[PDB]
Nucleic acid binder design. Structure first.
Lengths: 140, 33, 222, 125
RNA sequence: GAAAUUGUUGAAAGGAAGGGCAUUUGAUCAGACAUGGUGUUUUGUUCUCGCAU
RNA sequence: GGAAUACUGCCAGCUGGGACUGAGGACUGCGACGUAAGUCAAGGAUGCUGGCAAAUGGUUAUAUGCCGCCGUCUUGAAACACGGACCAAGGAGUCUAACGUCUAUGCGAGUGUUUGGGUGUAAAACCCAUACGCGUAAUGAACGAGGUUGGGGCCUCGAAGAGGUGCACAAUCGACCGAUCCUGAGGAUGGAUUUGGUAAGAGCAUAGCUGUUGGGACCCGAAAG
RNA sequence: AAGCUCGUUCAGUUUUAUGUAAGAAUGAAGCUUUUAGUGGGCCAUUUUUGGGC
RNA sequence: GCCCUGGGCGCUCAAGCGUGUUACCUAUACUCUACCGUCAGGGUUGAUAUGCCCUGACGAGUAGGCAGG
């Protein structure tokens, strides 16, 4: 095999994705649910939180291309997401750490969510389309 | 084995015409009178 | 052995010297083009200010593109196109402007479109579709050494030198044009525009002399 | 052709043509492909008469065709002849005169660039 | 022990079909034959020198 | 007095969305980055991840979107024109005599053993004396078995080129002879009007496609002595 | 197809000479020799014939 | 200028007519690339061969000719 000259350039994320932004998932068991972006992982996935205590969505890895960006942002500076890593999702039934870490993460974000009025209930409600909707026109 | 297209792929564009670097570094394409 | 590094260093030094030579030549050509355009504009300004009409020089370079298919072509235009290397449709080459050639275009005018190109269009064509003829083979122009080896004796050692020779119609115009393989051009990106292509350009058609519009047409067909 | 020896000679001459620059190899290689009619016999008389050419006292003659003995000549100066086939009479005449008859391979090994070589063709009209 | 032709059974559809381009439905099948590839200790003519592993 | 803007053309200006393509196969090459190690979008794709014991997909039937009976015939490409109920087997430029071109083999101015003889492991295989099929000194073949101009190539000198050299023959004129037109020591003998070759042979045998006439002659058929 | 040998010689290509010495442009060879087949009309056009053809 | 006497459905400030301005529909045509073959050029053996290759161009067709199975 010849020496292919293709360097692993780091991923470039679209400007519409910023930490603390409200994300919407279009695929998966949580499709249609509203989630909060936290950190970008080395595997090109997005670390997000429901938070779990609000809508039941735990910390999960998601792909940007399947996520619709929104202008609504919330503070995420107080959450120490450095603990999470790609190795934190390997498996080779819920693990004990998955509960305590999720609770700790949600404790530092439930207050911020409650700071903005109607944001808790807004996240608790699953997003869905309606008759006559025109996503291209809508800003989301 | 593969025909690199100039204009695009600036790396190959620099192979031919070394003055392209000076042209891009001096904005000669929009030079004022 | 010591050859592996010595030969590499020697060839790298020679290539660096040739690169500097080509750089200075390209800078000189660009300065000459800018000075010529500025002088032409200044002459036009002086003519306008002095209340006298301008005497623009005759167009010394033209480009012709085949517009009609081989079918039903009368023998004389077909022979003219064959001797002009305009065999397949949507193909063209640069030709010197003379009565010997203007009268030739007059015959093939119904089946071809032509005009006066420009520096930008010529450079784009030479860089993209520029193909050289070596040992009767078609070799794309991708390295200055390839052009230098075939036209080194004529003082051409880079793609910029070839473009300068083609645009200026210098003494080596014959060799520069012959070395260039006939240009393969696609159909216009935006279309021919006119609903009927087979008509004179001056009456809403396509074929015929269009002067500067040929530059626009080529870029869409490039 | 189908002769294995002819194929080997053709291979050798093709190798020499593109690696020795001298046209002598190319001419012999082209003449090798000539058919039997295109390679008429070359009599020893034709070699003897041409051997009096100025500056040919020590030159070597190569005959791609077939060397045939002749009864119209008697005196044969000492010389060297190379050809694909040598007749018994011609071979004896050449050897008797103190000369040497050799194959094309020996000529190529002694004159890689065709030095001192002379090519004589046979009549066709 | 073959074709035209004909008899039992199973799939089919509505003055006609066998033919050509791409797909689904029903049936049916090669289905990858992966048998592969990585480094040690246990016992007998100290032991992986090599056999069951 | 002032800019602005519509329009034209340039940007070896920037920044995206979407479609196909991954073709080459350990490094040798042209380039950019860098003070150097080294890196690069720089003579063709790499890195990660998920689903799987039927996986992907193939033949076939049926329904959907579009398209649509054969060989010979006059020859203006043509409708018209013969043949076809279906199936298994058979079926047609095959063999030969005399004359060649083309390709290969042996020998070579020689070539050809096989009408026969010797011999034999017995129509097999191996050898040859007479002559004999064809040319080899003919249209006595030398003024010299040709100079004048060229010429695949050979080298002297010098890369480009210069000199000579000359292979088959490219063109011309001459030499010998069958021969053309005078001459008359019977046609001698000396020239010469033109003539058909020699120059310093180039051929014989076998094998393969192939050309044309004759034998039935690519196959079935044609009013009869 | 068949040998040679010139790499250059050629053109259904385009204007001044008066049809060309063209050191005008553009494109990119020759003699042979024998070897299968080849005996049509027509659409349009040209020369522009007369009274429909 | 148009009207009167002299493809189907339908169309009537056309979905008729002439013309001007943009967009779109798609041929085996054109432009980029994957593969087979022919044709042309070249590398090749102090062994890597009627072979292993690199580069370009070309691909209609009856009788007929040649080549390969």
């Amino acid at each position: 095999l010849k020496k292919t000259r293709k360097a692993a350039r780091p991923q470039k994320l679209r400007a519409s994705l910023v930490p603390g932004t409200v994300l919407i998932l279009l695929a998966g068991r949580f499709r249609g649910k509203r989630v909060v972006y936290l950190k970008h992982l080395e595997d090109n996935t997005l670390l997000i939180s429901g938070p779990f205590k609000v809508n039941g969505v735990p910390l999960r890895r998601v792909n940007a291309r399947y996520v619709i960006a929104t202008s609504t942002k919330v503070s995420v500076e107080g959450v120490n997401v450095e603990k999470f890593n790609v190795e934190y999702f390997a498996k080779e039934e819920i693990k004990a750490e998955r509960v305590e870490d999720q609770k700790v993460v949600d404790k530092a974000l439930i207050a911020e969510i409650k700071k903005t009025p109607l944001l808790k209930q807004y996240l608790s409600a699953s997003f869905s389309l309606k008759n006559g909707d025109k996503p291209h026109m809508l800003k989301f | 084995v593969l025909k690199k297209n100039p204009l695009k792929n600036k790396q190959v564009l620099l192979r031919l015409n070394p003055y392209a670097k000076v042209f891009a570094a001096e904005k000669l394409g929009s030079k004022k009178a | 052995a010591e050859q592996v590094a010595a030969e590499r260093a020697a060839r790298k030094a020679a290539n660096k010297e040739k690169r500097a030579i080509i750089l200075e030549r390209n800078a000189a050509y660009q300065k000459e083009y800018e000075t010529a355009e500025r002088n032409i504009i200044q002459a036009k300004r002086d003519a306008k200010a002095a209340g006298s009409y301008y005497v623009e020089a005759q167009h010394k370079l033209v480009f012709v593109v085949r517009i009609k298919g081989i079918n039903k072509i009368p023998p004389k235009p077909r022979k003219v196109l064959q001797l002009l290397r305009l065999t397949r449709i949507n193909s063209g080459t640069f030709v010197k402007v003379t009565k010997a050639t203007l009268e030739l275009l007059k015959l093939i005018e119904p089946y071809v479109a032509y005009g006066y190109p420009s520096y930008s269009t010529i450079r784009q064509l030479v860089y993209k579709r520029g193909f050289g003829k070596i040992n009767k083979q078609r070799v794309p122009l991708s390295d200055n050494a390839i052009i230098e080896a075939n036209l080194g004796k004529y003082g051409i050692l880079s793609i910029d030198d070839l473009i300068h020779e083609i645009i200026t119609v210098g003494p080596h115009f014959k060799q520069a044009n012959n070395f260039l393989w006939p240009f393969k051009l696609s159909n216009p990106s935006g279309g021919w525009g006119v609903p009927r292509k087979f008509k004179h350009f001056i009456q809403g058609g396509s074929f015929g002399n269009r002067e500067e519009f040929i530059n626009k047409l080529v870029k869409s067909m490039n | 052709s189908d002769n294995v020896y002819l194929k080997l000679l053709v291979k050798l001459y093709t190798f020499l043509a593109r690696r020795t620059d001298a046209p002598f190899n190319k001419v012999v290689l082209k003449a090798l492909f000539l058919s039997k009619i295109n390679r008429p016999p070359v009599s020893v008389s034709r070699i003897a008469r041409a051997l009096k050419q100025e500056g040919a006292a020590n030159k070597t003659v190569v005959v791609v065709g077939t060397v045939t003995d002749d009864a119209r000549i008697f005196e044969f100066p000492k010389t060297t002849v190379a050809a694909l086939r040598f007749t018994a009479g011609a071979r004896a005449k050449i050897v008797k005169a103190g000369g040497e008859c050799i194959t094309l391979d020996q000529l190529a090994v002694r004159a890689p660039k065709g030095q001192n070589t002379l090519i004589l063709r046979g009549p066709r009209n």
